[PDB]
Design a protein around this ligand. Structure first.
Ligand SMILES: *[C@H]1O[C@H](CO)[C@H](O)[C@H](O)[C@H]1NC(C)=O
Ligand SMILES: [Mg+2]
Ligand SMILES: [Mg+2]
Ligand SMILES: [Mg+2]
Ligand SMILES: [Mg+2]
Ligand SMILES: [Mg+2]
Ligand SMILES: [Mg+2]
Ligand SMILES: [Mg+2]
Ligand SMILES: [Mg+2]
Ligand SMILES: [Mg+2]
Ligand SMILES: [Mg+2]
Ligand SMILES: [Mg+2]
Ligand SMILES: [Mg+2]
Ligand SMILES: [Mg+2]
Ligand SMILES: [Mg+2]
Ligand SMILES: [Mg+2]
Ligand SMILES: [Mg+2]
Ligand SMILES: [Mg+2]
Ligand SMILES: [Mg+2]
Ligand SMILES: [Mg+2]
Ligand SMILES: [Mg+2]
Ligand SMILES: [Mg+2]
Ligand SMILES: [Mg+2]
Ligand SMILES: [Mg+2]
Ligand SMILES: [Mg+2]
Ligand SMILES: [Mg+2]
Ligand SMILES: [Mg+2]
Ligand SMILES: [Mg+2]
Ligand SMILES: [Mg+2]
Ligand SMILES: [Mg+2]
Ligand SMILES: [Mg+2]
Ligand SMILES: [Mg+2]
Ligand SMILES: [Mg+2]
Ligand SMILES: [Mg+2]
Ligand SMILES: [Mg+2]
Ligand SMILES: [Mg+2]
Ligand SMILES: [Mg+2]
Ligand SMILES: [Mg+2]
Ligand SMILES: [Mg+2]
Ligand SMILES: [Mg+2]
Ligand SMILES: [Mg+2]
Ligand SMILES: [Mg+2]
Ligand SMILES: [Mg+2]
Ligand SMILES: [Mg+2]
Ligand SMILES: [Mg+2]
Ligand SMILES: [Mg+2]
Ligand SMILES: [Mg+2]
Ligand SMILES: [Mg+2]
Ligand SMILES: [Mg+2]
Ligand SMILES: [Mg+2]
Ligand SMILES: [Mg+2]
Ligand SMILES: [Mg+2]
Ligand SMILES: [Mg+2]
Ligand SMILES: [Mg+2]
Lengths: 93, 19, 271, 46
RNA sequence: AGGACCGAACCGACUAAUGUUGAAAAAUUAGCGGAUGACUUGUGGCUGGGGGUGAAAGGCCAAUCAAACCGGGAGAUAGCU
RNA sequence: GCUCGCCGGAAGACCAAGGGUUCCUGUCCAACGUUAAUCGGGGCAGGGUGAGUCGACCCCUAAGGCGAGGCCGAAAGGCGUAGUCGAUGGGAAACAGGUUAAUAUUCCUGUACUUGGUGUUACUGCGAAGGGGGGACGGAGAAGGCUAUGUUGGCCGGGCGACGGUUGUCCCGGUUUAAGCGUGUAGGCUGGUUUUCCAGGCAAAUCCGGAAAAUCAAGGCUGAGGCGUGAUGACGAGGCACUACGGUGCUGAAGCAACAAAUGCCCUGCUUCCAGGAAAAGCCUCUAAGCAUCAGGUAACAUCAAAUCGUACCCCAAACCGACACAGGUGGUCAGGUAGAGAAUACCAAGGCGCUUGAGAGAACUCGGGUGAAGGAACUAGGCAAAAUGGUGCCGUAACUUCGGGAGAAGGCACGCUGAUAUGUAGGUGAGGUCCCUCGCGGAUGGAGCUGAAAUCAGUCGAAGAUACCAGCUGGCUGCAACUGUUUAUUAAAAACACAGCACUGUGCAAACACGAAAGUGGACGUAUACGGUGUGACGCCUGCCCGGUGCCGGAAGGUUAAU
């Protein structure tokens, strides 16, 4: 059992894109930006407790930040974790 | 000014030997 | 048997091979196998300390019994095996209590023949007695130098030791070198001669055959520059130096034995 | 032609990496010199 | 069977022409040698500078070698320009 | 968009390594791009990498590293034991189809599999850091059985031809389907089973090893492929409907056989040889201490878990190593057609490209090629370069020789196409049917169909039949080195180095010797038929005279001579 304090720190944002939109209307799946240290179990616990929906399986990947230039000074965006969270048959978010 | 000179590079012809 | 190859290729013309058909064609006895990775003549500093060592065929080490401590229990020779670690052939022997061991294969010893070690052992080849229980004039191999240490003298192909004289607690041994050395009477020897005496009649025939046995080329001192070797240098073939090792020590007759601890056991040198 | 630099990250790290430096007193003196000079990158590790 | 024979891959480098501020700080093109072996190749490991390693050419040891490279003694010394 | 050309054992495809956003989309063209650029691996912004099964991590070790104590060393440190790390090796499990602008064995659909935890039920000797088995291993060669795969026929759908002919022995296309589960075949290995005892396996052992009976001779292990199921599904040439002309929606025929056939599989096999061919764990089994109607073990069923990190993209290259969008370098995997011995070569397929300045002109001269009258090495240091030879079969083949060679010596003859022999032969393959049958993936007989050289005879076309590409020049005398090898990365490949063989010499093992202030380590888990050093250099015939000098080895009457 995971503390609610920990479950409130693993979901950062819903990820908005065409692939996220397509996944939500085709494979009843929600795409979330999650904490980089979050586990599949913690994501599957947090979504169920904070959105009151039934989760089938969590798929996760780590997005490597891009090297960007801002006034001929090289910089790097932070790496973040993306969660493909598959809900059951009829739940809706 | 002048750029740093190159290390030795291949030479097309032998220096003539005078002896 | 010593068989000459036919000159079908130039590298086979001079080849003389020792074809022994009484050798186990199958795999060796696994329980008495250890790995022994090669050195390339390099020590724990990673430096070449013995030149001309490297490559050659991968070899597993056969745990050979040189001690022959298992006394009173009769042993039958199962098969003669090829051993890549030594010039001698080795015999796989089965004692009457189940235990199997490798021994140096003495001349004559075949499969079926019975061997036995100890004080009351019979006087026949393969049998290992303490040398005070072996008659004077006998021919022996796998001779211990200290009681219980295991055989160190006369292990190589066709080698043997003659027990010439027994005096008190010591026996005098004529070694293959021609040396007369004293050893403790208690020290164990195996009767007979070490087999595979035709081992010296082999002609490797080509450079590669040496490279198979793990020997790398010897470069002559006189072929080098002075910086590399005392014999180095010269316009054309020159020498004009007393022959020396790569390290300046004279190499054509200079005695290098310096062991005052073991001098007392030497009755007469080879000279 | 084969040039002298044939990259391997494993060999790089083992030969020059942070832990390799820390393993010997001379290696630790390298780190001390580089910190003293104020290098942004102490070793190849990064 | 073979350090066997012919010959691609693969490894090499005998000849010629080209190129020589190159396409290339060692190549290209046409021929050339080895091609089951003392062969060749990937990965990792070990050997350190009067030291290594060398089938030995003073060869090779990061485009550097009759003593590597980097920092230091150091503004060596220079009856020379 | 049409045509043209180029690669196609690659200039295609998939990776590792390495790089790190170069990927996809929109937008911009200053700079970057050897030109312009609307384009880009360029600028800017947004997107994109989804795993119990792939890989890492992880368990296990190799070389080697580190190394508690320890031994050693002025200090720093060196070595190494117990250990602990270290892959390039060993160790559980997923396949086909579909899908995105960009990921997919990761998403979806269908159908699987593995390991562990927990619970239930039944039955029960469980238990290791220990013992045994296993894991577990070389080179070469050979043959059979196979599949990938291809070809042809059948089958199905479509076609009837821009110019003579084309309803046929005609043309084009398709003819695909996995893991898993079941079966247990070609082949390979081994004789089972029971009882009794035992100086062995650090102790024990029901396991292993050994010994002694008894009975039965067919039992076990291993194993490609095939076949069945998986699959009433999926895919499917095209056609019917929408086209924002990018691509969505919808339906769906045949889906068989024969022959050929790998370098892949059976095969970690088999045969053979000498140079004699990792380790450890997982796994299987055995008990010890211990635990005794308990824990734990075995089986079935149910449920739960399988985290974390990588996953885009390039990868013989414009993204890696070469300062460059550089004719260079870079390990693994895949391997279609015709001809061919072939992964050579030529032309093609799939697929990918035309190499990021063009346009003219048609001087010398340079480069890379083609051809050449007569002559034919007169060239030149030298036939340098070029020209030439070049395949297969048969015939034929010198000196010399270590009897293997030399040898493809040299030299001569034949070669296409068509018909016949024979509507396609020898050979290979092998259906239906019949018969036997311990009844199956069987055996025997049987030659339907399929595939298919080589040769002979006859005819026939060309100047030429090895027609292209491809593909030895040959012979004679002689120096040197026996030979295959090795070498001056980048002006020297040799007669130099090495080499088998030979000899001398050292070396008795705590070996000589070498690396090391030392401990140690190599030599060697070797032991004089061994090991080091030196010189010589296959083989054959041989290797003479000299010991004064300088080394070395041995002797010792005296003379001299150190510290003390
Ligand atoms: C070029 O000259 C160097 C000396 O500077 C060398 O001699 C080299 O071999 C020369 N190369 C040529 C082709 O002559
Ligand atoms: Mg999933
Ligand atoms: Mg993942
Ligand atoms: Mg100036
Ligand atoms: Mg030697
Ligand atoms: Mg020699
Ligand atoms: Mg020289
Ligand atoms: Mg000298
Ligand atoms: Mg001379
Ligand atoms: Mg002289
Ligand atoms: Mg050959
Ligand atoms: Mg070379
Ligand atoms: Mg070439
Ligand atoms: Mg050859
Ligand atoms: Mg060849
Ligand atoms: Mg010289
Ligand atoms: Mg260099
Ligand atoms: Mg110097
Ligand atoms: Mg000074
Ligand atoms: Mg100065
Ligand atoms: Mg960018
Ligand atoms: Mg792009
Ligand atoms: Mg421009
Ligand atoms: Mg861009
Ligand atoms: Mg180790
Ligand atoms: Mg310590
Ligand atoms: Mg250590
Ligand atoms: Mg480990
Ligand atoms: Mg690995
Ligand atoms: Mg892609
Ligand atoms: Mg087939
Ligand atoms: Mg092959
Ligand atoms: Mg990819
Ligand atoms: Mg390139
Ligand atoms: Mg370009
Ligand atoms: Mg290559
Ligand atoms: Mg080709
Ligand atoms: Mg012209
Ligand atoms: Mg011209
Ligand atoms: Mg011409
Ligand atoms: Mg002419
Ligand atoms: Mg003419
Ligand atoms: Mg003529
Ligand atoms: Mg002339
Ligand atoms: Mg002239
Ligand atoms: Mg020529
Ligand atoms: Mg020519
Ligand atoms: Mg002459
Ligand atoms: Mg030669
Ligand atoms: Mg040669
Ligand atoms: Mg050179
Ligand atoms: Mg050269
Ligand atoms: Mg020792
Ligand atoms: Mg010589």
């Amino acid at each position: 059992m995971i503390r609610e304090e920990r479950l409130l720190k693993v979901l950062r944002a819903p990820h908005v894109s065409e692939k996220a939109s397509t996944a939500m209307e085709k494979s009843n799946t929600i795409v979330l930006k999650v904490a980089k240290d979050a586990t599949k179990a913690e994501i599957k616990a947090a979504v169920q407790k904070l959105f009151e929906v039934e989760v089938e399986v969590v798929n996760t990947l780590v997005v490597k930040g891009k090297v960007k230039r801002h006034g001929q000074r090289i910089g790097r965006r932070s790496d973040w974790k993306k969660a493909y969270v598959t809900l059951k048959e009829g739940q809706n978010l | 000014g002048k750029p740093r000179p190159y290390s030795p590079r291949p030479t097309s012809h032998p220096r003539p030997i005078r002896v | 048997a010593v068989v000459k190859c036919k000159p079908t290729s130039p590298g086979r013309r001079h080849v003389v091979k020792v074809v022994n058909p009484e050798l186990h064609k199958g795999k060796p006895f696994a329980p008495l196998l250890e790995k022994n990775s090669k050195s390339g003549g390099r020590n724990n500093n990673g430096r070449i300390t013995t030149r001309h060592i490297g490559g050659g065929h991968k070899q597993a080490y056969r745990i050979v019994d040189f001690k022959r401590n298992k006394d009173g229990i009769p042993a039958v020779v199962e098969r003669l095996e090829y051993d890549p670690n030594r010039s001698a052939n080795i015999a796989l022997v089965l004692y009457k209590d189940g235990e199997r061991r490798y021994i140096l294969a003495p001349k004559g010893l075949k499969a079926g023949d019975q061997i036995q070690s100890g004080v009351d052992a019979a006087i026949k080849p393969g049998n290992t007695l303490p040398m005070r229980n072996i008659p004077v004039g006998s021919t022996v191999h796998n001779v211990e130098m200290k009681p219980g240490k295991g055989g160190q003298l006369a292990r190589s192909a066709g080698t043997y030791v003659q027990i010439v004289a027994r005096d008190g607690a010591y026996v005098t041994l004529r070694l293959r070198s021609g040396e007369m050395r004293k050893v403790e009477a208690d020290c164990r020897a195996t009767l007979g001669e070490v087999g595979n005496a035709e081992h010296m009649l082999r002609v490797l025939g080509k450079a590669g055959a040496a490279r198979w046995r793990g020997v790398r080329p010897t470069v002559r001192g006189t072929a080098m520059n002075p910086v590399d070797h005392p014999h180095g240098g010269g316009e054309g073939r020159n020498f004009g130096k007393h022959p020396v090792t790569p390290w300046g020590v004279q190499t054509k007759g200079k005695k290098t034995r310096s062991n005052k601890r073991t001098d007392k056991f030497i009755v007469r040198r080879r000279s | 032609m084969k040039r002298t630099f044939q990259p391997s990250v494993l060999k790089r790290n083992r030969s020059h990496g942070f832990r390799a430096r820390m393993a010997t007193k001379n290696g630790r003196q390298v780190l001390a010199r580089r910190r003293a000079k104020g290098r942004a990158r102490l070793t190849v590790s990064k």
